[PDB]
Amino acid sequence: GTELDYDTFCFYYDWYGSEAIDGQYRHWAHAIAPDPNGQNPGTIPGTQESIASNFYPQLGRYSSSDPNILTKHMDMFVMARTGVLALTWWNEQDETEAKRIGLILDAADKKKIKVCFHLEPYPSRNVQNLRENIVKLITRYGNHPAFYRKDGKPLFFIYDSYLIEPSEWEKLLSPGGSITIRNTAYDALMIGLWTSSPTVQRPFILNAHFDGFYTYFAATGFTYGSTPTNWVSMQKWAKENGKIFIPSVGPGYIDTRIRPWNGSVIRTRTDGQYYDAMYRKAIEAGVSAISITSFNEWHEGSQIEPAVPYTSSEFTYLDYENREPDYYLTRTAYWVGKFRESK
């Protein structure tokens, strides 16, 4: 009852910097989003006192490229029993991205953690450059011992997959598609983002030839897909149609340091009871895999990574009290155990 679970995927963000490694506190400093409804909202400067999160990391303003931080993160995945790190991927095409991905794979392998990619909506993303990038990632990293495979296939999560028409997806994902990956060296499990109602999403997923779907959002009720009372029926549909459903569960949500106008999306943690309810619903739906939003999306307040109390002259941060800083790692391990009992 301590082993890693390789059907548990934790969304991981590698965009943080520190002075020690990067020469800058990247992402800890962040622009404030204007209200979508002549605004000069400003920027959070990423100083010790004022970072782009409502919470404060136990590890401080860390770099995602610091091998010592990465070691600690992998030890945290081990504590949480989460066997797969689902790495945000933005197609930066820069040496710093390449170095960091290699460091993450190397650190993961030391702890028997696996890595898969979460393909983000990069500029001009389309099925042709997606194919090229899938080929690139499999070619570059597919022989790394930490690269994730399920039944011989890589797995990719595709964020905002609805931004691309099913007629385009079918070219890549139907066995007869014009630029198919099916039956090729680059075949993979492609997990699209289920957002809205079944009348829209069922034909989208079928016509796009996705292997499965996930829901991402940590805030219950943000979308149809992130409303856990829909998960039993979503799983039934998935099983009937040979699709893999990977619901996303998270411990809470708050992004109001970077999106001050987005308070209606706040979901309170209630000393773990929110996380418990969401994780229970995923397990009760009878799914074969679960995704966790998030390890370390600090901007969105969905992180399970340890956080500490902090009051600065500029902001009084939220924290996990009356739970301890590692509570969400140990509670994740509890739920992984419950999930494994159900498999």
Ligand X SMILES: OC[C@H]1C[C@H]2N[C@H]2[C@@H](O[C@H]2O[C@H](CO)[C@@H](O)[C@H](O)[C@H]2O)[C@@H]1O
Please give the residue ranges that form the binding site for ligand X (CB under 6 A).
Answer: 88, 118, 120, 159, 297, 299-300
Q: Distance from CA of residue 185 to its chain's centroid?
A: 26
Dihedrals phi, psi of 273, to nearest 5 degrees: -70, -30
- Name residue 193's beta-bridge partners: 214
Q: Which residue minimizes CB distance to ligand X?
A: 299
Judged by beta carbon, residue 159 or residue 327, the one nearer ligand X is 159
Dist. CA 225–CA 293, nearest whole Å = 14
Judged by beta carbon, residue 123 or residue 152, the one nearer ligand X is 123
CA atoms in the 13 A half-sphere facing the CB of 270: 10
The CB-of-200 to ligand X minimum distance in angstroms stands at 20
The helix/strand/coil state of 141 is helix
Judged by beta carbon, residue 162 or residue 334, the one nearer ligand X is 162
Selection from 14, 24, 17, 216 nearest residue 107 by Cα? 14
The CB-of-294 to ligand X minimum distance in angstroms stands at 8
Judged by beta carbon, residue 163 or residue 200, the one nearer ligand X is 163
The CB-of-11 to ligand X minimum distance in angstroms stands at 6
The identity of residue 10, as a single letter, is C
Judged by beta carbon, residue 159 or residue 169, the one nearer ligand X is 159
Selection from 243, 13, 237 nearest residue 118 by Cα? 13
Dist. CA 17–CA 311, nearest whole Å = 22
User: Which whole-number Å values give the CA distances from 283 to 6, 142, 213, 231, in the listed order?
Assistant: 15, 31, 16, 10
Judged by beta carbon, residue 41 or residue 175, the one nearer ligand X is 41
The CB-of-27 to ligand X minimum distance in angstroms stands at 6
The CB-of-249 to ligand X minimum distance in angstroms stands at 15
The CB-of-93 to ligand X minimum distance in angstroms stands at 16
The CB-of-182 to ligand X minimum distance in angstroms stands at 26
Read off the DSSP letter of residue 218. S
Selection from 231, 214, 102 nearest residue 158 by Cα? 214
- Name residue 147's beta-bridge partners: 115
Judged by beta carbon, residue 283 or residue 290, the one nearer ligand X is 290
